[PDB]
Design an enzyme around this catalytic site. Structure first.
Site, PDB file in Angstrom:
ATOM      1  N   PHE A 170       0.853  -1.195   0.000  1.00 23.17           N
ATOM      2  CA  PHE A 170       0.000   0.000   0.000  1.00 23.17           C
ATOM      3  C   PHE A 170       0.891   1.249   0.000  1.00 23.17           C
ATOM      4  CE2 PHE A 170      -3.113   3.163   1.151  1.00 23.17           C
ATOM      5  CZ  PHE A 170      -4.316   2.692   0.679  1.00 23.17           C
ATOM      6  N   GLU A 171       1.970   1.202   0.768  1.00 20.90           N
ATOM      7  CA  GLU A 171       3.031   2.208   0.696  1.00 20.90           C
ATOM      8  C   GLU A 171       4.402   1.549   0.660  1.00 20.90           C
ATOM      9  OE1 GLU A 171       1.360   4.562   4.134  1.00 20.90           O
ATOM     10  OE2 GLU A 171       1.803   6.227   2.789  1.00 20.90           O
TER      11      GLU A 171
END
Lengths: 284, 282
Positions: free
Chosen positions: A45-46
């Site tokens: 996601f990151e």
């Protein structure tokens, strides 16, 4: 010449739980396009990219989602702190400073079982716009809810870097939320980047990417604002440790430790596990 | 503790095409562990290899984040390139990758950057021909109108995993968005997934069943698409050609295809090798 990235889980007391994160401990050879491209490669996601300098306890950091750069305090910083502790060694508490474009963030890490516990000081939360009554209703319906599904506490934009519209809803409403409208221009009017749905009683939240397609397991950048909100509106105690919950609708239930000081300062912490060390095989 | 590798399939350079994790020896991983690592790494598919009876034969297990998908597709190309990396060898190397009852023949060669790999998907099987009402319903399920169908008949086509190929215009392809549940309608047609196809542009798009995550380059659909194009006179039997996928994820991919005149549909492309990962937990 060796360059590496690492796969970690944040807000995770065991491996393969919590929020997955890729960390590049020395991204000095990468330009911005390459950082964005590597983020899309690894599909966490990151991803966070660290740039060493002349101080062994301080690094510049760059954080990306698959959509864009997000230069604001978040849980990738907790993962970075844990990794830096792993690389340095030492049985004692370690202190770190991570520099994002907008601000500096102080972190601490300790060893904990198979991994680490890391904590960050996000500073005091800034309380921004308050949507009017019609606007509050609109946001509820953009997530397949009604105006009655809202709680008795004011939706507000709250920020420790990245501004979230916190939208207090009922526990029942939270479980059936689905983004069906474009939120960009509505959020623009309020000076907000993302919506965070919040059950204030259960201290549980839900949040997605901009399109409402991928749900985030556990959002450190929202955890600060949420903690500050709960304390501001008398729903949680100042100066006491409490926990926020996120990720159970993705079958990755996670616990985010939060606290608001007398100063206003909000600290966010969690356990971190290290899962894999990857050696890059391409040209630098 | 053990080992996996990050590769890109159908990728002319690193950091494009379909990213893939390959576990080169999954002999001690149970199915739950394979599925768990797949979900951790978040590659659209991960593949797990287990030694066969033969240094060129392997059993393979392919997982998406939802389920096992035991069908010839992009992960086999990545596995072949990695096996070539590990074994060494100068010329074309041949491999047999077993997916349940299927023995898939793969060939790999070293390239200037990475490898080239190809698979023989066998003969394509054609199936249902949905009626006009049903075709319109599927277009609408992707936020498209009847007018966005390009006129080439939708068909279910398979080299193992049946896809409803839905021909739409380029304009339509670029604004497609799933807004309806597809399972009942696909089940009725004997199809597993929808592949939206711009036949003239030779470009497609496809997602997981919920329409949430888009696949960059779908090897299991590429064979069916090539067969379809040849069947309907949009490409010539025997001539290699190229399909395009991944632009909408900023990861453009080149998928080489050929419907050979002896029936076999071949799918291939360049494969890049990006990273070697060592597990730090058991």
């Amino acid at each position: 010449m060796s360059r590496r990235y690492w796969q970690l889980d944040v807000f995770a007391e065991r491996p393969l739980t919590g929020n997955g994160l890729a960390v590049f401990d020395d991204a000095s050879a990468l330009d911005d396009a390459a950082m964005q491209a590597w983020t899309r490669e690894l599909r966490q996601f990151e991803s966070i990219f660290l740039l060493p300098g002349d101080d062994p306890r301080a690094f510049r950091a760059r954080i990306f989602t698959l959509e864009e750069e997000l230069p604001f305090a978040g849980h990738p910083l907790l993962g970075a702190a844990a990794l830096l502790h792993h690389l340095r060694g030492g049985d004692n508490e370690q202190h770190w400073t991570l520099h994002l474009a907008s601000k500096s963030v102080a972190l601490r890490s300790v060893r904990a079982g198979s991994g680490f516990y890391a904590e960050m000081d996000q500073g005091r939360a800034e309380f921004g716009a308050t949507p009017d009554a019609g606007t509050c209703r609109w946001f509820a319906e953009a997530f397949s809810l009604s105006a009655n599904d809202l709680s008795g506490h004011p939706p507000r934009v709250v920020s420790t870097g990245l501004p979230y519209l916190l939208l207090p809803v009922t526990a029942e409403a939270l479980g059936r939320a689905r983004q069906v409208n474009d939120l960009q221009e509505a959020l623009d009017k309020l000076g907000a980047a993302f919506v965070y749905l919040l059950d204030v009683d259960g201290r549980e939240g839900r949040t997605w990417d901009n399109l409402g397609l991928v749900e985030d397991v556990a959002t450190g950048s929202a955890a600060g604002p949420v903690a500050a909100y709960l304390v501001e509106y008398g729903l949680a105690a100042r100066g006491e440790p409490f926990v926020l919950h996120q990720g159970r609708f993705l079958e990755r239930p996670s616990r985010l430790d939060v606290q608001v000081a007398t100063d206003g300062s909000v600290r966010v912490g969690g356990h971190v596990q290290l899962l894999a060390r990857a050696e890059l095989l391409t040209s630098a």
